[PDB]
Chains A and B, each alone.
With several copies, the nearest count.
Chain A
Amino acid sequence: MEGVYFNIDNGFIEGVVRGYRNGLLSNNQYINLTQCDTLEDLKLQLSSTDYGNFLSSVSSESLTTSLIQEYASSKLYHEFNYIRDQSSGSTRKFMDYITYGYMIDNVALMITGTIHDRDKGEILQRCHPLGWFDTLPTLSVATDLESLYETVLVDTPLAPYFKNCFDTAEELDDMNIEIIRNKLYKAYLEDFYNFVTEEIPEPAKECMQTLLGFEADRRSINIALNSLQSSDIDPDLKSDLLPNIGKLYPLATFHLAQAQDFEGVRAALANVYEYRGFLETGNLEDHFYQLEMELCRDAFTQQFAISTVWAWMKSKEQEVRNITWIAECIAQNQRERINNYISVY
């Protein structure tokens, strides 16, 4: 069974990630964060959690929402780098595959900032330090997508993902880069799905398959809801952006590819059972965040599985997003919508 040969390499990693998991904030702790008046009260209230002595040795007057999200993200990133250093074999590969999806976002961000003639150092910060890949600041030269690819991208692990991206052969603007990036992330999700299907053991295999299914479905609905802006897009030129994985591909990405208005997307999602609860109500992004957190919560019930790393990563990112939203509502005196955090624990 699954508990037999797992611990030999991954028992220490699994125990440490469960110990990280036990420090996730519950509902009462978020309510205590909501009841803070100033920002120093928020610092003192966060000090009595797993975070504590993280804003020690900063200041009492240089405390800012941006500084709090920087340090709360850096703690996450150092913990992930520790767990990635303590692994080998298939787990090391799996965590590198977690890193590549942020590498794609850094590629798109650096190219987009290079188009608008911004500084190298401005784009080098706010550029998500986990997806680094050493030859990243060299993407600020030589605007043409080929003269990026034949020079620096072939030696990166993102090299097998540009097999579709060489159709247009001109200088780039803001819509071409997004078409490129969507093709990247499509090929990426299908590479990582076929990785999980063949090497990861079974109770982690099914959990990672359903989590990747939700990632593909969320990005399919986002591309279908963003592609009906002011352009003309062939359904043949749009169905190369929706991934061939998920519970809405065998036939429901077809009606997303052939859709003109918002009602076409509503009628496309009307037959998939988990969906069509989303478009007839308010903030459409919070439904994806809530369903992702419920799936990640369901991933913590399997014990001998390395789906725990992915589930804890996404849960801790949602936790940082919640603390940033609460800190914004405290610092700007906008307490009307402070209870819109997403807490499942």
Chain B
Amino acid sequence: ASVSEGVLRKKYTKFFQENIKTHLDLKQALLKEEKPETALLAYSLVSPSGYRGEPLTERKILEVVSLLDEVKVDGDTYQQLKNTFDSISKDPRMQVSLENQYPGKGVGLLVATGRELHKASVNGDAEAYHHQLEQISQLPGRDQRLSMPMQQTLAIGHAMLSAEGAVGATLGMATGYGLNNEVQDQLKQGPMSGVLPRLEISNVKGDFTFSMQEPAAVRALMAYLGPKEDTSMSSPQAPKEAQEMEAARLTLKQMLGSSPNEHLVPDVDSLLKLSDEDMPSQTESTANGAFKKLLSEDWDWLMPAVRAMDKGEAGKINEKLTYKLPLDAANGRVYLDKSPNLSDAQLDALDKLGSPSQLRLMYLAEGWI
């Protein structure tokens, strides 16, 4: 109802037939019709980074992200995303989020193997947590333009880190490469992520440009959309620079599904505790322990529990999820059942959350709650 991609490289193959290797003199070749003002909008994805600081300026995936930037039918939903990005790119608060995920821009064989079997299992769980999360935003009431490609990027990024865990554990066990490029070529097959705008950054440290199909720029965008608004920056008392970067911030936080009351501060650190005043308020702390139970009790229970909660029917969770599996016993097949044993205390806490925001479920899939 909100997203429909394709993989037809033969419908518009004239843009990829000749050896076009120049960012300049490509807008005339990208017109190709009697439409001019809307063919420049698909060129706006690569145009601020089309000259400054890039190698060879036309990599073979930079055209398919610009060809399949389908603005031909609809020119409203992508323009709203383009009016919001580069309006979000003004405060240092987005920029300090784009510096935490980055740098500056014998018995010892049993230990080093276990450090990389832990890496292959954490990233194998977290990749599965985004596959059952791209079918929660398939349910009615959600949206798919911002929710789908944001978490399709992360599921590709966890599939590569999980592959590097046990390829490294194999080459260390069989000793005490070309396999990482074979799996990198394999995960680009099949579908591909929807096009989001470019998120250029210009400041006193230079003029930077990130990609938003990188798993580290996605991971810093959702950390920006976390915290609630304050008493400042949205009142008309301060018309200075705030209302064009705060209403652009809240129109993405609502676009996931998070109301401006919802706080959602991250957790990962090297410290013991986080703080005192930004703590979850024991109604969602009881509820976050119920969602973690649904992630780690079955591979298929998070989607029909959110579906049962959008209808306001979050008290029938113990009965709508029960199903029966067989068991060979000493008396025969018995057909016992598996139910999520949600207690009444955390079944009540799922009621006071009206619907889980998509931003809350994506912090949960990254281990930030």
Contact call B323/A258, Cβ cutoff below 8 A: yes
Contact call A236/B335, Cβ cutoff below 8 A: yes
Q: Which residues of A contact B325 (CB under 8 A)?
A: 254
A254 to B324, CA, bound (A): 10
Contact call B335/A155, Cβ cutoff below 8 A: no
**Chain A min CB distance to B192 (Å):** 22
Contact call A154/B324, Cβ cutoff below 8 A: no
Q: Which residues of A contact B324 (CB under 8 A)?
A: 150, 235-236
Contact call A154/B323, Cβ cutoff below 8 A: no
Contact of A267 with B by CB under 8 A = no
**Chain B min CB distance to A72 (Å):** 39
Contact of B239 with A by CB under 8 A = no
Q: Contact flags (1/0) for B25-41 with A, using CB distance below 8 Å?
A: 00000000000000000
Contact call A159/B323, Cβ cutoff below 8 A: no
Q: Contact flags (1/0) for A129-165 with B, using CB distance below 8 Å?
A: 0000000000000000000001000110001000000
Label chain B's interface by main secondary structure.
strand
**Chain B min CB distance to A146 (Å):** 9
A236 to B333, CA, bound (A): 11
Q: Count the A residues whose beta carbon is within 8 Å of the partner chain — how many? A: 9
Q: Which residues of B contact A254 (CB under 8 A)?
A: 325
**Chain B min CB distance to A197 (Å):** 18
Task: Enumerate B320-357 residues with CB–CB distance to A below 8 Å.
Answer: 323-326, 332-333, 335
Q: Which residues of B contact A150 (CB under 8 A)?
A: 324, 333, 335
A258 to B324, CA, bound (A): 10
Q: Which residues of A contact B323 (CB under 8 A)?
A: 235, 258
A3 to B198, CA, bound (A): 69
**Chain A min CB distance to B135 (Å):** 12
A330 to B324, CA, bound (A): 53
A236 to B337, CA, bound (A): 10
Find the residue from B325, B326, B332, B333 having the highest chain A CB count within 10 A: B333
**Chain B min CB distance to A133 (Å):** 15
Task: Enumerate A231-269 residues with CB–CB distance to B below 8 Å.
Answer: 235-236, 239, 254, 258
Q: Contact flags (1/0) for A98-139 with B, using CB distance below 8 Å?
A: 000000000000000000000000000000000000000000
Q: Which residues of A contact B335 (CB under 8 A)?
A: 150, 236, 239
Complex: chain A residue closest to B332, CB-CB: A154
Q: Which residues of B contact A236 (CB under 8 A)?
A: 324, 335
Complex: chain A residue closest to B337, CB-CB: A236
A122 to B345, CA, bound (A): 55
Q: Contact flags (1/0) for B104-132 with A, using CB distance below 8 Å?
A: 00000000000000000000000000000
Task: Enumerate B32-61 residues with CB–CB distance to A below 8 Å.
Answer: none
Complex: chain A residue closest to B326, CB-CB: A239
Q: Which residues of B contact A159 (CB under 8 A)?
A: 333
**Chain A min CB distance to B247 (Å):** 42
Complex: chain A residue closest to B331, CB-CB: A155
A159 to B333, CA, bound (A): 10
**Chain B min CB distance to A270 (Å):** 14
A239 to B324, CA, bound (A): 10
- Offer 15 A-B interface pairs, CB within 8 angstroms, sorted by A: A150-B324, A150-B333, A150-B335, A154-B332, A154-B333, A155-B332, A159-B333, A235-B323, A235-B324, A236-B324, A236-B335, A239-B326, A239-B335, A254-B325, A258-B323
Smallest CB-CB A-B distances: 7 pairs = A154-B333, A236-B335, A150-B335, A236-B324, A154-B332, A258-B323, A155-B332
